[PDB]
Design a protein around this ligand. Structure first.
Ligand SMILES: Cc1ncc(C)n2nc(CCc3nc(-c4ccccc4)cn3C)nc12
Ligand SMILES: [Mg+2]
Ligand SMILES: [Zn+2]
Length: 312
């Protein structure tokens, strides 16, 4: 079915847009990713059946949580596609392969719990992964699927390029740890404001990719207001489910994960846009000017959250 899939011509036009919402096309998501892969990395990069067998196993290894699910994975892949498409030249063929795959796998087997939870309540995953707990497990899950029968989409690569792509994927997936973003953005802004940013520099390159992975991970805030508001509901549903477990252990969770504090969501978003989102897309537009619509869309939703606080 997925091998014999064809995208409607109307989707082909609108998929290129940054603000495009995949929500309405649930059954077309696997085939949408294939489409984006072929448009970005050509039709020959992966063996069709290997890619399709890989994709459907990635889907199966996302749980049915409120936010960090198959929908989110594909939404994050699309935003990268849009970034890559508008900045195709800056990145290598192998970087475009890995980054799209990485976005699709970046929350693989996500349990609906934060890194703080797993570490604080000694979960097995926190035992073998100290910092960036779930993120390291996501890459570990990505490699596991790659090592299943007929799933190794990179099998035809040279051992050198195989090791290169995995390290781009690894770095990309670890970068989606929002704890590491704040440091990453600070340096990248520093490298821009001084004029010392250079894409020939590998470490600078990895930092730019890291920011792109954050921009993509957060992109629900760059959609049209109704889609942004709806996804926000899915986010807090996951946080509140985690806070309930902390409450069940007597421990009061942080306001963000406390459903009893749902009143302070608009204020909480207002802070998230100011502290995280706006600075994220601001620095990204300065490095990659064609990504500007992401900042515009984020700004619009910022004023919407301001509009919600004022009672309008
Ligand atoms: C849109 C979005 N995309 C991605 C991510 C990771 N997130 N995370 C948030 C939570 C923001 C947030 N809500 C609160 C809060 C809410 C109610 C009561 C008290 C505090 C605080 N903060 C920071 N939203 C997003
Ligand atoms: Mg994640
Ligand atoms: Zn994510």
């Amino acid at each position: 079915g997925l091998m014999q899939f064809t995208l409607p011509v109307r989707l082909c036009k609108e998929i290129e847009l940054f603000h495009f919402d995949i929500g309405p096309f649930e059954n077309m998501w696997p085939g949408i990713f294939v489409y984006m892969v072929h448009r970005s990395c050509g039709t020959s990069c992966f063996e069709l059946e290997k890619l399709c067998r890989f994709i459907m196993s990635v889907k199966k290894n996302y749980r049915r949580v409120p936010y960090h699910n198959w929908k989110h994975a594909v939404t994050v892949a699309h935003c990268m596609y849009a970034i890559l498409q508008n900045n195709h030249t800056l990145f290598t063929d192998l970087e475009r392969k890995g980054l799209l795959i990485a976005c699709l796998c970046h929350d693989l087997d996500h349990r609906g719990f934060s890194n703080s939870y797993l570490q604080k309540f000694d979960h097995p995953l926190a035992a073998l992964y100290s910092t960036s707990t779930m993120e390291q497990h996501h890459f570990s899950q990505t490699v596991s699927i790659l090592q299943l029968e007929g799933h190794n989409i990179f099998s035809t690569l040279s051992s050198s390029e195989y090791e290169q792509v995995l390290e781009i994927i690894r770095k990309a997936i670890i970068a989606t740890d929002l704890a590491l973003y704040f440091g990453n953005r600070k340096q990248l802004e520093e490298m821009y404001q001084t004029g010392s940013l250079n894409l020939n520099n590998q470490s600078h390159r990895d930092r730019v990719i890291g920011l792109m992975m954050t921009a993509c991970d957060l992109c629900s805030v760059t959609k049209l207001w109704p889609v942004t508001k709806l996804t926000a509901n899915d986010i807090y549903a996951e946080f509140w489910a985690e806070g309930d477990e902390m409450k069940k252990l007597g421990i009061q969770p942080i306001p963000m994960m406390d459903r009893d504090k749902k009143d302070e969501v608009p204020q909480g978003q207002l802070g998230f846009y100011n502290a995280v989102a706006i600075p994220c897309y601001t620095t990204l537009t300065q490095i990659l000017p064609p990504t500007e619509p992401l900042l515009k869309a984020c700004r619009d939703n910022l004023s919407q959250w301001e509009k919600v606080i004022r009672g309008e």
